[PDB]
Amino acid sequence: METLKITVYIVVTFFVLLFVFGFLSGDPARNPKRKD
Amino acid sequence: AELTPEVLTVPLNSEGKTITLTEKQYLEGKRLFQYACASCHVGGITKTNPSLDLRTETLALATPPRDNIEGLVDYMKNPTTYDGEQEIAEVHPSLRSADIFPKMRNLTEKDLVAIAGHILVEPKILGDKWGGGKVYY
Amino acid sequence: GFAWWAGNARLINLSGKLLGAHVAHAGLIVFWAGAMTLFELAHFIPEKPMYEQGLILIPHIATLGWGVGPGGEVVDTFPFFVVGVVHLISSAVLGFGGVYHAIRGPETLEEYSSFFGYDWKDKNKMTTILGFHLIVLGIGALLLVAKAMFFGGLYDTWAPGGGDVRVITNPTLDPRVIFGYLLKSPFGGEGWIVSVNNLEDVVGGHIWIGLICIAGGIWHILTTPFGWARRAFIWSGEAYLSYSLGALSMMGFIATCFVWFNNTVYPSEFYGPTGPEASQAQAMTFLIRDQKLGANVGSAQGPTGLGKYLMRSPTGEIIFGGETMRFWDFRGPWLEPLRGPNGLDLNKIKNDIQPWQERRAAEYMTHAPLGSLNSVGGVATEINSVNFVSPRSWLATSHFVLAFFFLVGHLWHAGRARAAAAGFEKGIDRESEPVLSMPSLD
Amino acid sequence: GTTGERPFSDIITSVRYWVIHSITIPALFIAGWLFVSTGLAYDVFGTPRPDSYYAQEQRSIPLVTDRFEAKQQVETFLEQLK
Amino acid sequence: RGWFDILDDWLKRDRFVFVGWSGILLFPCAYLALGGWLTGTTFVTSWYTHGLASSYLEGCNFLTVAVSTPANSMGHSLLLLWGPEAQGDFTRWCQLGGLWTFIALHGAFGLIGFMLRQFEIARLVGVRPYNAIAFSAPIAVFVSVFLIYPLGQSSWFFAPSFGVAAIFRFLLFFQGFHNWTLNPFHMMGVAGVLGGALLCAIHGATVENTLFQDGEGASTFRAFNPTQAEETYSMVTANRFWSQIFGIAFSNKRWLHFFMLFVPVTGLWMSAIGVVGLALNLRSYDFISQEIRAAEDPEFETFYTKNLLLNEGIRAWMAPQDQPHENFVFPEEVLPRGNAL
Amino acid sequence: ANLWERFCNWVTSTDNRLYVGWFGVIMIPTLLAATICFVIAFIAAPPVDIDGIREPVSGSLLYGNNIITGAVVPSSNAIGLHFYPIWEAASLDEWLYNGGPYQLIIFHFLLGASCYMGRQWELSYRLGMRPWICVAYSAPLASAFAVFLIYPIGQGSFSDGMPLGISGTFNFMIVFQAEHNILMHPFHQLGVAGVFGGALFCAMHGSLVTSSLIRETTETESANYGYKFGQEEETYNIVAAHGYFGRLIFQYASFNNSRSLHFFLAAWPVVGVWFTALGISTMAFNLNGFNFNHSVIDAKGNVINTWADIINRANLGMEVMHERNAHNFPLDLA
Amino acid sequence: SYPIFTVRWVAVHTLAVPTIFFLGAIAAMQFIQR
Ligand code: CLA
Ligand code: CLA
Ligand code: CLA
Ligand code: CLA
Ligand SMILES: C=Cc1c(C)c2cc3nc(c4c5[nH]c(cc6nc(cc1[nH]2)C(C)=C6CC)c(C)c5C(=O)[C@@H]4C(=O)OC)[C@@H](CCC(=O)OC/C=C(\C)CCC[C@H](C)CCC[C@H](C)CCCC(C)C)[C@@H]3C
Ligand SMILES: CC1=C(/C=C/C(C)=C/C=C/C(C)=C/C=C/C=C(C)/C=C/C=C(C)/C=C/C2=C(C)CCCC2(C)C)C(C)(C)CCC1
Ligand SMILES: CC1=C(/C=C/C(C)=C/C=C/C(C)=C/C=C/C=C(C)/C=C/C=C(C)/C=C/C2=C(C)CCCC2(C)C)C(C)(C)CCC1
Ligand code: OEY
Ligand SMILES: [Cl-]
Ligand SMILES: [Cl-]
Ligand SMILES: [Fe+2]
Incomplete structure (x- = not known):
């Protein structure tokens, strides 16, 4: 169960981190008109 | 049908004497019962001990008999268990315990008669619904 | 515009x-x-x-x-x-x-x-x-x-x-x-x-x-x-x-x-009272009433086989029975005097409930x-x-x-x-x- | 895009409109009120007043239970009040 | 150019309220059905048919007034004012439930009038008559619920009464007695109605968020002209959006708007069919396999069995007051009740 | 052109057949987790003690259910609002008996559907569109949050959240009426107006546009082939449509602005469903539908029943039977 | 140069006149006592 708890903790942290940093990677600029 | 003096006539004591409430008294008593009593006795039941109701036939069998104005007014000052064996002012609203039940503080002697009268009249209007519970809603 | x-x-x-x-x-x-x-x-x-x-x-x-x-x-x-x-x-x-x-x-x-x-x-x-x-x-x-x-x-x-x-x-x-x-x-x-x-x-x-x-x-x-x-x-x-x-x-x-x-x-x-509080107060009210009548609230098995008045939580604490089992996380000044290390204490329940606790439970049950x-x-x-x-x-x-x-x-x-x-x-x-x-x- | 009737906005902002209708509107209201305050509404429609749902010592509904004798049944209940 | 043509001329003049020949049927029947409802809900009791108060005059509010159905003892009488039951007496007519049949029957001819109006105006103006077609679903619902259902039962008494809470009671009656949630024809109507509301919202939102910029103002409403030939929103960008969000998207604006006709209209047609079944107590009440297992195996329990206990609750607790003419007397001891409650 | 900027560029790419996006990065796994657990539980989960009384309810197909009666059963009342992941159970056997899979499903689902809403914002921005489709979808999303989260929180148990099954849904809505009188609650009444009216206006709009299609085809062809994807000209005549509907009612009860018409289509059911979701969400804190029980009495004091009293009779039969073994005391306060 | 009495005129008063009457009737009702 502890193995599993640990796995899931790691998996969630991974995807949450991708989310936060993805939106910090100049997301306003990723659109078809005015980029900045 | 209407609120006739016959339905407003209730027993005053166990001697058999009677008192004829007014419509004003009956409605005053209804309002006071809601104010001070209904949170537990809505409809003549007892939410915190459903084995004991405000039905007339139940009050008749209480020790001190309580199917009369007097017994009810005494109950509101010094409540006892159903067999009269123990005083329960400390867990039941009463004038004796208005320190711990503050809604009893501003009740006058005439207010007690009005509450007592409402309780004795209401089963005459409502029958089994009074004290009967949800079967009869 | x-x-x-x-x-x-x-x-x-x-x-x-x-x-x-x-x-x-x-x-x-x-x-x-x-x-x-x-x-x-x-x-x-x-x-x-x-x-x-x-x-x-x-x-x-x-x-x-x-x-x-x-x-x-x-x-x-x-x-x-x-x-x-x-x-x-x-x-x-x-x-x-x-x-x-x-x-x-x-x-x-x-x-x-x-x-x-x-x-x-x-x-x-x-x-x-x-x-x-x-x-x-x-x-x-x-x-x-x-x-x-x-x-x-x-x-x-x-x-x-x-x-x-x-x-x-x-x-x-x-x-x-x-x-x-x-x-x-x-x-x-x-x-x-x-x-x-x-x-x-x-x-x-x-x-x-x-x-x-x-x-x-x-x-x-x-x-x-x-x-x-x-x-x-x-x-x-x-x-x-x-x-x-x-x-x-x-x-x-x-x-x-x-x-x-x-x-x-x-x-x-x-x-x-809170929803949880009122629901706990109801179980307390009828535990008090029934025990005064002579019920041994601790040993009373209810319809389901769970205790009628008292049962265990999933981690073992003694808690009120009936549907309020869900509210056992409730804590309140009127209730805490009855809690011991394992939850509600049967000896405090049998011996130490006070009228002010009876009053309060009755009040809160009726003002849920x-x-x-x-x-x-x-x-x-x-x-x-x-x-x-x-x-x-x-x-x-x-x-x-x-x-x-x-x-x-x-x-x-x-x-x-x-x-x-x-x-x-x-x-x-x-x-x-x-x-x-x-x-x-x- | 009009069909020739006078515009509503023009009618209700008009002095003549409000000269007629400051009478007609309160008069009909007063008519409606009197229909009830006099009691007529009860007798017209057959609606029990608060004292005539039941007889004094009666807690039985006066339910119609016959199709062709229904009219008379209602009448019999009504006379069980007089 | 004789009198028939001159009257046709006049019925079909362009005025604030178009009349037409359908107007002869529509306008008195709609006005009488609506006025009968307002008259009865303001002034008329249900004391002799139902043992209920049901008018403002009696103390009821908008949620509890109704025009209630006639007594079960009337059977399916038309309850004509001049018929053998009321015999011309207006007062008794109201007290016997005559306003129920009055409203239902004039309502039914009213809907016929309205649907003929849709046909009439469409022919005159030159459009296809699909709005009339779509209105067939409301008609099917009305006649199946308000006429067929009570005609297969014992009397009008069991039709819906025309009131807010009276209709709430009708919904609950159908659960306890017909187990109507379990009926697949209702389930298809549910999907037709919720399906339409989704279509309504999703299409409106889509148009409003794929608009072309056709003016400079922040209020995009002004940049539409009803005579412009050009589409006002991008079907192409809408299509891309939904293809990438949801997988699939509309690409044919005609199919899209036909589908919006089709979905709710079919839903209502389906529910009507099931109610026709319930006219005959032809219910989808049980699953036999479930009942055989459960009778034999007291440890087998499903949401299906749990809901029938609720039904049984509803029946025994509501029947004596909801069917006063049966004189149901259920002693306390026979009422089904779970523990404590 | 560094590894990260390339991943970012694929995540947000408008060339992907299904748009992913940053919201999609959370949405995809949470939805796959909920979907797989749901399917497996629906088919094979063993019976679940929903109400904490050791009276397990069989939900799955292999344990004697059909599609209509099947459900993934809510988690045990003994658990209440406690968090019950797999790794908190002594075994999967235990987790299965106490309804663990329900919690896993409703939490992954509420998360993934929330991210679905934001995904709808996100692609609108990548495509140059206006942004408020996601606002439309917040009405259904809020309704799912109400029945799976808010109502559990207010009543203190996920065992009173809505079951994931057809008949379990009906059980949830019958019990809700008994306890909250949702029918006499005005926010539910506004929901009915939202969904009935939205079904109406869907049929209206679809019949009026279909009524005014411009002739482009023969009677041997579907009329639908008279429209070609991305043509610039409108495919129906809105002024004919207005000329018909304005005469059916009267002129000013008909739209001639297609923009305000479609805004109206969007707004009526959205707002009606916000209210009905708010109804469930506030009955979660027991502010219930109107109570007119015994409100009408006669000159003597007899109760004069209305239709609300009749409603009350049916509500009582529902109350006293539900969860028939699970109450020891006379009031069902949660 | 408008007409006063029209088909429109009639539909309006057919609805509006009984409305005001019924509103007065229902206002009076709030003062009835049992
Ligand atoms: C009204 C309050 C307020 C507001 C609007 C801001 C606004 C801002 N701050 Mg300031 N700040 C505040 C109070 C506030 N601050 C206070 C009180 C302090 C002292 C502690 C600071 C200290 C501070 C620092 C040190 C810095 C800022 C910076 C900034 C800017 C970037 C913020 C950002 O990216 O956040 C978005 C948040 C993140 C990117 C991090 C996410 C991590 C959080 C904690 C996750 C939690 C989510 C969870 C659901 C919430 C539940 C609770 C949780 C703790 C468990 C922005 C203008 C930055 C800047 O440019 O400075 C000039 C910066 O470096 N702020
Ligand atoms: C946050 C609110 C706010 C803000 C940003 C401003 C800002 C401004 N005001 Mg407005 N004003 C406000 C509220 C506000 N005012 C209120 C509440 C009143 C009604 C009493 C006025 C009445 C007012 C007048 C009549 C005029 C202005 C003017 C001005 C301008 C010059 C102010 C100046 O030089 O004073 C600088 C500072 C002082 C003079 C001393 C202020 C010390 C204050 C009173 C003590 C602190 C108060 C405390 C923090 C909170 C209240 C306590 C309470 C909780 C018990 C400036 C743009 C002038 C203007 O626009 O002219 C063209 C002008 O003529 N203000
Ligand atoms: C809290 C609510 C609130 C507030 C504070 C404001 C404030 C404002 N509005 Mg908005 N607005 C609101 C609600 C609100 N609005 C709503 C609900 C609507 C929908 C109809 C609008 C629609 C709207 C429009 C369409 C416009 C504004 C505009 C404005 C601004 C200029 C108004 C002007 O010139 O008044 C002129 C009005 C008067 C001279 C009339 C009398 C007003 C007084 C203050 C009445 C109240 C008196 C009060 C009892 C005084 C007590 C005195 C005591 C303090 C001594 C002003 C700052 C305007 C703007 O943006 O300008 C660029 C503008 O065009 N508003
Ligand atoms: C701090 C809160 C706040 C602030 C300052 C603003 C400010 C603004 N909003 Mg936003 N908005 C908010 C909260 C807020 N909003 C919330 C909570 C919602 C969700 C409902 C919205 C939804 C929203 C929309 C949909 C739109 C805006 C728009 C706008 C702009 C114009 C608003 C205007 O003129 O209204 C004028 C005011 C009215 C027309 C009155 C509204 C009346 C409300 C709906 C009825 C409330 C009645 C109440 C429930 C009581 C009933 C009892 C009865 C007796 C009345 C302005 C910048 C507009 C925009 O985007 O501008 C850029 C726009 O289209 N807002
Ligand atoms: C409760 C739900 C509901 C109501 C109230 C309703 C109402 C209406 N729908 C109409 C139309 C439509 N409805 C349609 C589809 C739908 N309609 C639906 C659901 C409803 N539709 C659904 C779900 C759909 C999708 C299939 C279409 C496609 C149309 C139209 O074209 C038409 C329209 O113009 O829309 C704007 C209008 C017909 C007007 C008319 O006949 O005037 C004449 C009035 C008459 C003849 C009187 C009828 C009397 C009734 C039958 C009996 C009496 C009722 C009492 C007066 C009231 C009792 C109230 C209590 C029960 C609470 C009217 C606004
Ligand atoms: C801008 C604008 C607006 C807004 C406005 C506002 C919002 C205002 C406010 C204002 C205010 C906010 C006001 C206030 C006032 C107050 C006052 C004026 C007060 C006074 C007081 C007094 C006088 C007192 C007295 C007393 C005492 C002292 C004691 C006790 C008793 C008594 C109570 C008697 C509007 C929307 C309209 C529109 C547009 C414009
Ligand atoms: C039946 C009958 C008949 C007929 C009748 C009629 C036709 C009637 C009409 C009537 C009518 C025609 C009535 C009306 C009424 C109305 C009313 C009563 C109204 C009210 C309303 C209101 C109350 C409203 C309000 C409101 C609200 C609440 C919210 C929003 C705003 C408003 C304002 C809308 C005859 C004689 C043949 C005989 C037989 C029987
Ligand atoms: O309503 Mn009735 O109340 Ca909300 O709990 Mn008490 O009972 Mn049980 O578990 Mn599901 O259900
Ligand atoms: Cl149940
Ligand atoms: Cl319980
Ligand atoms: Fe459209």
């Missing part, structure tokens, strides 16, 4: 008219706080518990320790009058400044004075305004500390002897306790910050927040946004409004759960937070008679509704801010449609 129905949007770039809009609207809030309080006082009957009377502001003042004494009994109503009058009076001044700035004062401020004027795209000016307001909020949080420590204290439902106004001499400063709350799970038996169950933690948390807000206020006066922040955000007045809209929505949801579960900073004495919209108390099948809806239901429901619409407002204004910032909030340029310049998906 806005229509009459979006007319306040015409204020985005009129800093002087928009200032009057804000100050006049603050007048309305203070007005309400004053009028509402005086309304509640005119109607207040002190012999009745506050929670039979439809009161929501008087309970907030009592909780701060004004007007009450031991057991929550109201001793002096004059602090209620004062709080109402002063708010009412102050709304006139806010009203005066707001209408003056909306009708008569400079339409824009940035020509009248470079200190009060602002451009939404000025990240330095904007963080400075934010910094001032943080310092102000920090002061506010420290005024609660001032009251608790140096000016009479707060109402403590957990005080010995039925609750009382108590002075807080040792506020919790240990950061493992204060911040440990923020890291508690929001699920059951944890409850995040809603589980705060004592005034030392309440007061010390406000010490912390006051210092953090003053610290951060000074920080934002002295700095400007780092480039990573500059790139993550949209820098516009509507974007700023949308950020605040999400914040208030979050806060409204938290407050909903606070008033529904917490009986420390919302004393049940004033607000009525259930009632109709037209204020008939109780379960939906109950007949008319009892005029009652718990202040907890009124506060919970209203603020759920407001929190929901402000998250809608957040999404509305965040999406429009994004699109206005990229230049396509009025629609698609027929001559430069992005999809027509993309390859097709198949």
